[PDB]
Amino acid sequence: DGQIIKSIAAIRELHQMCLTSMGPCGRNKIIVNHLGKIIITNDAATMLRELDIVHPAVKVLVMATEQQKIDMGDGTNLVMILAGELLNVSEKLISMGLSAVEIIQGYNMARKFTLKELDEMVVGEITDKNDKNELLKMIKPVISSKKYGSEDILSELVSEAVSHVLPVAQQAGEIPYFNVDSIRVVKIMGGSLSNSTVIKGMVFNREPEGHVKSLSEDKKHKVAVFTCPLDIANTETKGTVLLHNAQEMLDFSKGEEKQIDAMMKEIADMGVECIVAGAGVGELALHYLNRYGILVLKVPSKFELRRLCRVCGATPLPRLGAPTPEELGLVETVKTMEIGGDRVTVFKQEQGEISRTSTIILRGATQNNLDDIERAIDDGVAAVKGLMKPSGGKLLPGAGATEIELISRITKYGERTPGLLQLAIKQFAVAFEVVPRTLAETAGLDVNEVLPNLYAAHNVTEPGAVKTDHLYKGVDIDGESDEGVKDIREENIYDMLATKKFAINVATEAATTVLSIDQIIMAKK
Amino acid sequence: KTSRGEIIISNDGHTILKQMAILHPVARMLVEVSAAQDSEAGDGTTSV
Amino acid sequence: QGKGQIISNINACVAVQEALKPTLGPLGSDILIVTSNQKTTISNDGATILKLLDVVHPAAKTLVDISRAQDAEVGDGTTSVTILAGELMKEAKPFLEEGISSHLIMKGYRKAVSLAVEKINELAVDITSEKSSGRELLERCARTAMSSKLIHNNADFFVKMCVDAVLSLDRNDLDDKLIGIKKIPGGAMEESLFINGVAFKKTFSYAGFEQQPKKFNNPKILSLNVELELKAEKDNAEVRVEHVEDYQAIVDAEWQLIFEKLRQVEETGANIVLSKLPIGDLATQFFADRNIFCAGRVSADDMNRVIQAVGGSIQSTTSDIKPEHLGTCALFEEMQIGSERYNLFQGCPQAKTCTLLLRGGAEQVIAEVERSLHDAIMIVKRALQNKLIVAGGGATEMEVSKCLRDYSKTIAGKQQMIINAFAKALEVIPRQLCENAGFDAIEILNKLRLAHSKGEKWYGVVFETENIGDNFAKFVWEPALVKINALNSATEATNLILSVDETITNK
Amino acid sequence: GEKISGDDIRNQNVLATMAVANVVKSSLGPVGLDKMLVDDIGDFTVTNDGATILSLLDVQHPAGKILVELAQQQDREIGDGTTSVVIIASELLKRANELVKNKIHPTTIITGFRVALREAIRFINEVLSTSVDTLGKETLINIAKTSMSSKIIGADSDFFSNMVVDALLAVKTQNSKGEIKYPVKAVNVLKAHGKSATESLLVPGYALNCTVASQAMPKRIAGGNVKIACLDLNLQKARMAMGVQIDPEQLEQIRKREAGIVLERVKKIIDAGAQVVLTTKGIDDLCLKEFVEAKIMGVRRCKKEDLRRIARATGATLVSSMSNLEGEETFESSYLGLCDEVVQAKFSDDECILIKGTSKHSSSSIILRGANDYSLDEMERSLHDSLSVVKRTLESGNVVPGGGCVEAALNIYLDNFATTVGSREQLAIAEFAAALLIIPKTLAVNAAKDSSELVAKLRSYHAASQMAKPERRSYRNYGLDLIRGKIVDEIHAGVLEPTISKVKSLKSALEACVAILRIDTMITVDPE
């Protein structure tokens, strides 16, 4: 009673915190790290990342949540509350005397049963591939997990970002995998939601070189990405300058100027529109660069250069020579426009072609609110991934309506499994009852009013009519909170099948790991 | 609040200065002024 | 945790809210705040107050993050954004006692702001035509801000000199970097000068000080980063030497390397030679015989302003100087104020910027003067793209306040009380004004109800005559477009604070 | 000593009174619940009555003692429904802090509240209920169902409604120069363990709980004209002299002579004819055997306070010592009274003498049986408080509807009254009207319901009543239902509260908030 029990109290502190952080009506939190990192968000996943992990099961939950961010990442607190609810139910099962092995068998046999029940709730089977219009409608309810304040403006920023990156190629074009890292959102302080724009190229914040980026209106240019940074010529090992006489003293400064005349003119002989320089250069480079009108990228980062190769379409030359006419990228317009008070260099083009790896300028008043929107873009493009790499993710009824039908299915499975499974399976359906109660608790409604509404829809029965109203109706609160019922087909709030498919395997894995712990052993910690 | 716990709520100048604890030597003689105002005048102490 | 954590986050904003009460309005007082830079800030506008304010509770940084967003957006009168947002949190205390969720509060204030964006366009009017315009409208808008903070009595002379400096700004360009100025200590508080170009203080002294000519009729500007001094070479100066006479040749070579570069400076003939690095005493006595202006230890920001003014450039080689790298101006007059000489660049090829030379020993005065110029460029930007204004004094929010009470009265039940609390929260702006002006807030706010209903629209509150009158006819006006982003930003910040039920602090 | 000036005193006073007020607000209304107090001395009492709790609770800041004395004044006026009374003045201090921050003078805050309550007297007279008014079958039963609220005894309302009403009908007496009123506090309430409230017994008269000392004494006395004699004389071996002190046979004769006179003193009681005799101090078996041969029912270990109400009700003269104008010790026949019917009944494994038909002073006793002491702790103070409401009901027929009907109605009268006075006091009326609405809002908090949804609908029904003077009824309506969350007339629900209870509630609440607003500073002298 001092290990398998008290370990639940460690998660119970985090379980109660996840109840108020789940759903569109959930509550935010303030996080202060030990190094000074401040995080304000409604997602408990980032909370467990920076939080110091003491109890071993805390690390078990954050790693299981990290697996969701790699795959789905939409509503990760759904399985966390479900896993935390199993511990609250575990106190009821342990009090009954069920062994830890048989309790896992109750969840394991129900896991394979739940995965088979996901096929009965399938709705919205067919979906378009390259059609953006139908994609913008299905991505809108995905935002409802996070702040729902404006779902139209966030969809328009994705519309212009996907339109550039989308290969199109209607019918069968052998469409490759859609890159998630290509779309990158940049937080910009100030401006409203409508002030945000989309950059087809790479949006950078820095100072222009000669005066400002221009001359690209006529298009027809050539840009080559250079992997080797341009810097002062030197060997690998640290050398020392040794002069044999006093005549070489005056030729040392002139000898370096001869290298600037040789190196800067040779690289500028082809007239590249935009040069990629990863290191620093001298002030004498402006002689040849401004003469030929070459735009300079000054000290980029490591991760921004990998995304630049798909924008300019230039071959990543391993060494820095003279620009080769054989391998060159096609870039038309490069301009610099002031937005938030500083000159912003953008690679955005105007028609003429469609390249990949676009960017989005995110303008908002509150920088803390931009963190939730930044995570919404990551979960927004994750919704497209389910309809891209797999054959399809289809749809399932959202707003907890899918778990309501499962309660009746799990209940029927318990009557057909006598023995120790009677207490395990019947309480396994109770673990699905916390999902609708979580949405009702964050909304402030009384559970006494919601309870008969949850029993009415999917629990009673399904009439013989085709496409019954029970499947297309769900729990939503706008003005209808008094009735407690709302049609989810008109609001078009749906979730993908891969959301719950990966969550059921985590709920059993989180329960199997924790409930099988006899004691905690720590040596010098 | 006196030392024995007696609570007296009033605006009377003679009552306030009676239980007032004064650590200033000259200001302690100001209580005698309020004592003479009650014996001689005895009315409108708040104004006097 | 729970309802007590939200109140704890609100109470952290109350300490900031109570400190910013005097910071709004012409008759509002000032607050003294000491920082870690040993700079005592006495100011009216709360623009730079929130940046230098010491934050104790972590939740208090929410008002600081939204302040920098409105800093570059508006910058003038932005202290009322946190005050109004503080009232929304302060008036939410009886709402926390009820079962009303913060999201129901979120929808209440959003519908009031969503309509307020439409009301501001309706409450204002397009002026244009032959009415107040440049040299007139710009003077009326800049006088409201500036005269409401410091130099109350002498604002007639002080603001007139600053308004005439903004007149040099023209459309079709409207560069936002033109507001860069300098700080000149010393002199009289009522004395100020106008300069159309970059000014930089000596900051060093050398033997050729008194021999430096202060007046050039047709100077030539040249920018060089070469430092003049005897010092070791770039990487390694090691030289293998055999003969003995070659060691004195090295001393000659070290001299010939410098002395040849010294001749190249005088070979150009540019009457203005600026060094980005310091200048030593080795080149002083030589270059002084040429009698050309020179300044060392120049900041990198001032060198970039010259590049953006006369179109010059900085080169490390004299033989590579191009013909266009030598700029010319109309006149060069070096001014000396308090034994400190100041260079002046007049008649640059393209200069839309005006650097105001101030006076006085108080460092906190220029804080709002630089902020007044930051608001002056906002007035020009917001007078072009969309032409309209509203009344001044801060009574504009009271006109839309009652308009929200009339509409929301019949709208969907409980949502009336939440919006009525927002309209009640809009009354804090005249409330803090009546407190600092010694007026009676009860009688004034009761008359405003008739002044904003039967009194049509434009009638404001006049602080000078202690009466209620029209600020629109008074010609004193306040920028209308600055309130659009000010009212909407405070709602998203208030809804975020009220949605935090717990605070985590590691270590 | 320690003296602090400014708003620091008024801020610490309001926060201290509000903290202790929010503790007793959970008992408001029928949905309220009792709470436990830990005295650290080993004693604890679980009740919702604020009169005892505020007296037991240690007051930290001396300003909190003002609200403690406020609950003591309610006992001398009404004494019942303290959960709905003392919490009204606590809300006036919360909104007062916002007015102190303003330029409104503290006396202007006071003056604004003085004209508000003075005019509120006529506001109550508009919704005032007459003596007949609603159906009012016995007019007590309708009020008896209201007294069941605010307490946890509401589940027994099927009984207590008949218990309190039928018992107090015989309490009517003629006193105060021909004034007809019920002598409250003369009703004795008895408690018994076991069964439920349905086993209670109504005694139209006085009932004393006691038995006979010796089991051989007759326990049954029937018939009329039963005389009772209260004897407080201590029968024991007499002590010695002032210390001057004094043949052991003559020394033992002192006890022989004394006990011989004690036996003669009982023989004088035999010639009186009283059926029941009482004795305060205990005795040995010698004097107890004489009571057996006396054919008179005696009782020992008697409480003095119990016998004081016997001589008052019956009319017999209480005799602490046997003496007359001469030096003879005897008992005169003029010290005995008369009663209509006196009989001793066996109740709950015990017996009690029922004294009914008292001619001198008429009263009644209620003998109730219940679960146990801890379960009857709340039922004790509640029934003692309900005796005052029934008194005030038949003393003055003015009553008002409960459940937030008065507070919701006064807001509408003050809305037109605020614009009437105007000037600077208009804001004080708005804050005073909003403070009265906090009590019905906290009523639904303990019921876990939405108060603002009901207040918005309830006030709209009271508004349609005042807006139309001529009125059949398409508009007028009132009442608030906590269970169903609907608006229904209280004539069907049967919730009505006396007007004198609500008038004195707001009358005493006026000076309660003023006492705090008149405190400029607080100084504390260290004890010796």
Side-chain angles (χ1 to χ4, degrees), chain D residues 219-231:
Chain D
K219 294 176 179 177
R220 299 289 182 268
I221 294 171
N225 290 336
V226 175
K227 294 177 179 178
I228 185 169
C230 296
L231 178 63

Side-chain angles (χ1 to χ4, degrees), chain A residues 17 20 24-34 38 40 47 50-51 147-149 189-190 211 240-245 249-250 252 257 283-284 286-287 338 341-343 365-369 478, chain C residues 9 58-59 61-62 65-66 68-69 101-103 106-107 110 176-177 225 233 235-236 238-240 250 253-254 257 308 314-317 320 322 489 492-493 496 499-507:
Chain A
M17 294 176 70
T20 59
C25 296
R27 300 290 183 269
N28 290 282
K29 293 181 181 297
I30 293 170
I31 297 169
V32 176
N33 192 341
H34 61 284
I38 295 171
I40 294 171
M47 176 179 72
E50 296 301 321
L51 177 63
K147 183 178 179 180
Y148 62 91
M189 177 178 71
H211 182 62
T240 59
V241 176
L242 177 62
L243 297 175
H244 300 291
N245 58 33
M249 293 177 70
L250 296 175
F252 178 80
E257 294 177 350
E283 294 178 351
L284 295 175
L286 295 175
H287 187 279
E338 182 178 2
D342 291 344
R343 294 182 181 175
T366 299
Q367 294 178 336
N368 291 336
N369 289 336
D478 186 4
Chain C
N9 291 336
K61 294 177 179 177
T62 300
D65 291 344
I66 62 172
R68 292 192 297 273
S101 64
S102 63
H103 299 289
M106 175 178 71
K107 294 177 179 177
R110 181 178 181 172
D176 290 344
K177 302 299 183 181
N225 62 345
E233 189 66 14
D235 291 344
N236 190 30
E238 181 179 1
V239 176
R240 182 178 65 84
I250 294 171
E254 293 177 351
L257 177 63
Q308 295 300 321
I314 295 171
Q315 295 300 321
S316 63
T317 299
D320 290 344
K322 294 176 179 177
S489 296
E492 296 301 321
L496 177 63
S499 296
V500 174
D501 59 9
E502 185 177 1
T503 299
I504 295 170
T505 299
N506 290 336
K507 183 178 179 180

Side-chain angles (χ1 to χ4, degrees), chain D residues 4-20:
Chain D
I4 296 171
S5 64
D7 291 344
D8 291 344
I9 302 301
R10 291 191 296 273
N11 289 336
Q12 293 177 336
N13 290 337
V14 175
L15 295 175
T17 58
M18 177 178 71
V20 297

Side-chain angles (χ1 to χ4, degrees), chain D residues 478-493:
Chain D
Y478 63 91
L480 189 147
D481 186 4
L482 295 174
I483 295 171
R484 293 173 296 180
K486 294 177 179 177
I487 302 301
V488 63
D489 289 343
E490 295 302 321
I491 183 170
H492 300 290

Side-chain angles (χ1 to χ4, degrees), chain D residues 3 30 34 65 80 132 156 172 182 348 350 416 421 504:
Chain D
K3 180 179 76 179
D34 292 344
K65 293 177 179 177
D80 188 4
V132 177
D156 290 344
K172 179 180 76 179
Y182 296 140
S348 179
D350 188 3
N416 291 336
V421 176
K504 293 181 180 297

